[PDB]
Amino acid sequence: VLSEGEWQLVLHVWAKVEADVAGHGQDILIRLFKSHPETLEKFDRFKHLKTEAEMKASEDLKKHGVTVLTALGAILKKKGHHEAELKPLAQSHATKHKIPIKYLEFISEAIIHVLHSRHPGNFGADAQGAMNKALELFRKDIAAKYKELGY
Numbered sequence: 001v002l003s004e005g006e007w008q009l010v011l012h013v014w015a016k017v018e019a020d021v022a023g024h025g026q027d028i029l030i031r032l033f034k035s036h037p038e039t040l041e042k043f044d045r046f047k048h049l050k051t052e053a054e055m056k057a058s059e060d061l062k063k064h065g066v067t068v069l070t071a072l073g074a075i076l077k078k079k080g081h082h083e084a085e086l087k088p089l090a091q092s093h094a095t096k097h098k099i100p101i102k103y104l105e106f107i108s109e110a111i112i113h114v115l116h117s118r119h120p121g122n123f124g125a126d127a128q129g130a131m132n133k134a135l136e137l138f139r140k141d142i143a144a145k146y147k148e149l150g151y
C-alpha cells in the first residue's frame with residue numbers, strides 16, 4: 001500500500017514524463033531493447049531495428065512509446081484502483097504478446113534509468129522510492145492475472 005504522500009511523489013514525477021511523452025517512451029523502449037535484446041524479439045513490429053540509431057529514427061517506435069506510457073500514466077493516476085485498466089493489458093501481454101513478467105521488471109528498471117538520465121539532480125530519493133513502489137504494485141497485480149491464466 002502506497003501512502004498519499006508516495007502517490008503524490010509518483011504523480012509529480014509522472015508530470016515530468018507528460019511534458020514529453022514521446023521522448024520518454026522512446027528512450028524507455030530503446031533502453032529496454034538494448035539492455036535486454038530478447039525483449040525486442042517479442043515485437044514483430046520492431047525487430048527489424050538493429051542499431052540504436054535506427055531505433056531513435058523510428059517514428060513508429062515513438063508512436064508505440066506514446067501508446068505504452070499513455071496506458072501507464074492512466075494506471076498510475078488510479079492510485080492502485082486500476083483493475084479495469086490492468087485486465088486488458090494482462091490478457092494481451094500474457095496470452096497474445098507472450099511477455100514474461102520478468103520483462104515487466106526489465107521495463108520498470110528502464111523507466112527508473114530514463115528518469116535519472118533525463119532529470120539529473122531532479123529525481124529525488126523519495127520520488128525513486130515511491131515510483132519503485134508504484135511499479136511493484138503494477139507488476140504484482142499483473143502477475144496475479146498471469147498466474148490465473150497459467151503464465
Ligand code: HEM
Nearest residue numbers: 039042043045067068071072088089092097099103104107
Ligand atoms: C509498463 C509496461 C507496459 C505497458 C503499460 C504496455 C502497454 C501496451 C499497450 C497499451 C499496448 C497496445 C494494446 C495491447 O496490445 O494491449 C501494448 C502492446 C504491446 N506490448 Fe506492451 N506494455 C508494457 C510492457 C511491455 C513489454 C515489457 C513488452 C515486451 C518485452 C511488451 C510487448 C508489447 C507488444 C509486442 C505489443 C504489440 C505491439 C504491436 O504489434 O502493435 N509490452 N503494450
Ligand SMILES: O=N[O-]
Nearest residue numbers: 031035109110113
Ligand atoms: O534498463 N535498466 O537499467
